[PDB]
Design a protein around this ligand. Structure first.
Ligand SMILES: [Cu+2]
Length: 102
């Protein structure tokens, strides 16, 4: 139900891998447990066995703007970009952005 303000990660981005994940928040201010992590969970083959990818999280010009940039190129398949936003009031907001790559 709860989701960040606006972002451009890869909302069900099926067709090809994007350049970088984008995130925006009118009240980011992490300093809690906010972040992001990309996991390559291609089609179900090994009893659903996800794996974290070698990526990094870096904010844009503003600190309220997040920009995920993987050090490695996203190959075809399926991936899930799990992000977590939290302002300041316990109960962190969790979200995931799945996308395909062809
Ligand atoms: Cu709130």
């Amino acid at each position: 139900h709860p989701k960040l303000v606006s972002s451009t990660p890869a909302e069900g981005s099926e067709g090809a891998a994007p350049a970088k994940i984008e995130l925006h928040f009118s009240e980011n201010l992490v300093t809690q447990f906010s972040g992001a992590k990309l996991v390559m969970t291609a089609m179900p083959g090994m009893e659903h066995s996800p794996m974290a990818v070698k990526a990094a999280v870096s904010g844009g010009g503003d600190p309220k703007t997040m920009v995920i940039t993987p050090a490695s190129p996203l190959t075809a398949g399926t991936y899930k970009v799990d992000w977590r936003a939290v302002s300041s009031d316990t109960h962190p907001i969790t979200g995931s952005v799945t996308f395909k790559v062809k």
